[PDB]
Design a protein around this ligand. Structure first.
Ligand code: B12
Ligand SMILES: [Cl-]
Ligand SMILES: [Cl-]
Length: 274
C-alpha cells in the first residue's frame, strides 16, 4: 500500500516541506503522483524515513543520513549484490549511490571488474531464468552502460584517430565489447564505445564522420554473423577487427574482417599505423 504526504508527516515527524525538499535535493524519497499531482509514498519509503528520522535525532545530517540508507552501510564485498538488487527494484538513486561508494573503494578498472560487469552478467542470467521482464533488464542495462562510459573517461582518452567499438546488428551481448573498449584505452588506444546493435550503414557513416582508423566488433553469437552478406564488413573502416566466442577466422575472412582471439593482440595491432 501507499500513503499521502499528510499521512507520512504524521507517521515520521518530518514536515511536508522537508519531504518535498529531500526529493528535490537528494532524489529520495521518490513518490509517484496521482492525477491531481499529489504524492503517494510506498510503505518501504515510510519505514525508510522513520529510520532516517531516528538517525537525525541521534545527530546525523540529512544528506549523509539518506546516503547511509541508500548505500553507505553496505560492505565492499557486497557492493555488487547491493547494486543488482537496487536496479531490479527500480531504485536508481540507490543504485547511483552504490556506484559512487564503489568508486570510493576502487579505481575505474576495479569498479568495472567488481561492480559493473558482474552485475550486468547477473542481470542477464536472471532474465534467462525468466525472473525479470525486458523492461527491468533494459532499465538495468541502460544504467550500467551509462556508468561504463563514465569509467572509460576516468581511464583517460588518448590522442589520435578514434576506434569505434560495438557489436554486429542483432547482437545484444555487449560485455565483451565493454571489456574491449576499456582494455584499449588502458593500452593507449582512443576507443569510443557506441553500445551494441549498430546498423552497418550507421556505423560506416559514423566512422567516416569521426575519421576513425579502425572498427572493433564483438560477436558472442555466431548467428548474427552468418546472417550478414559476404564482405558486409569490408568498407566500414580502414581496418575492421572481429572477435569473441561467436567469431572465427573463416567467418571473418568471408566477411572482410581480421580475426583477433585475445585483447592483447588486438591492442598490439591497433598500435600499427596501417
Ligand atoms: C548476459 C546475457 C544476456 C543479456 C545481455 C546483456 C548485455 N547487455 O550484454 C541479455 C539478457 C540481453 C541476453 C539476451 C539473450 N541471450 Co543471452 N546470455 C547472457 C549470459 C548470461 C552471459 C553472456 C556474457 O556476458 N558473456 C561474456 C562474453 C561476452 O565475454 P567474455 O567471454 O568474458 O569474453 C572474453 C573473450 O571472448 C574476449 N572477447 C570478447 N569480445 C571480444 C572482441 C574482440 C575484438 C576480441 C579480440 C576479443 C573479445 O574478451 C574476453 C576476454 O576474457 C549468457 C550465458 C553464459 N553464462 O554465458 C547468455 C547467452 C550468451 N545468451 C544466449 C542467447 C541465445 C540469448 C538471446 C539472443 C536469445 C534468448 N532469449 O535466449 C537473447 C536476446 C534477447 C533479445 N533479442 O533482446 C545464449 C547463447 C547461445 C548460443 N547460440 O551461443 C546464452 C549462452 C544463454 C543460453 N541459452 O545458454 N543475454
Ligand atoms: Cl504532494
Ligand atoms: Cl554536500
Amino acid at each position: 500500500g501507499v500513503y499521502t504526504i499528510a499521512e507520512v508527516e504524521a507517521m515520521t515527524g518530518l514536515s511536508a516541506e522537508v519531504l518535498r525538499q529531500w526529493e528535490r535535493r537528494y532524489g529520495f524519497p521518490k513518490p509517484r503522483r496521482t492525477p491531481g499531482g499529489h504524492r503517494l509514498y510506498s510503505a518501504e519509503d515510510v519505514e525508510a524515513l522513520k529510520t532516517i528520522k531516528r538517525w537525525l535525532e541521534e545527530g546525523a545530517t540529512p544528506k549523509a543520513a539518506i546516503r547511509r540508507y541508500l548505500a553507505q552501510e553496505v560492505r565492499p564485498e557486497d557492493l555488487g549484490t547491493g547494486l543488482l538488487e537496487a536496479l531490479l527494484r527500480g531504485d536508481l538513486a540507490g543504485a547511483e549511490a552504490l556506484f559512487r561508494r564503489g568508486l570510493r573503494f576502487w579505481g575505474p578498472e576495479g569498479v568495472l571488474e567488481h561492480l559493473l560487469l558482474p552485475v550486468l552478467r547477473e542481470v542477464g542470467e536472471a532474465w534467462h531464468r525468466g525472473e525479470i521482464g525486458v523492461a527491468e533488464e533494459h532499465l538495468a542495462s541502460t544504467f550500467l552502460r551509462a556508468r561504463l562510459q563514465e569509467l572509460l573517461d576516468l581511464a583517460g582518452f588518448p590522442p589520435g584517430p578514434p576506434v569505434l567499438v560495438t557489436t554486429p546488428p542483432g547482437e545484444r551481448h555487449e560485455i565483451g565489447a565493454m571489456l574491449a573498449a576499456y582494455h584499449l584505452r588502458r593500452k593507449g588506444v582512443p576507443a569510443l564505445y557506441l553500445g551494441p546493435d549498430t546498423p552497418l550503414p550507421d556505423l560506416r557513416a559514423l566512422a567516416r564522420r569521426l575519421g576513425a582508423g579502425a572498427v572493433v566488433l564483438s560477436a558472442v553469437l555466431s548467428e548474427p554473423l552468418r546472417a550478414l552478406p559476404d564482405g558486409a564488413l569490408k568498407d566500414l573502416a580502414p581496418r575492421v577487427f572481429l572477435g569473441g566466442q561467436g567469431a572465427g577466422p573463416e567467418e571473418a575472412r568471408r566477411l572482410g574482417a581480421e580475426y583477433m582471439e585475445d585483447l592483447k593482440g588486438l591492442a598490439e595491432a591497433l598500435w600499427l599505423p596501417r
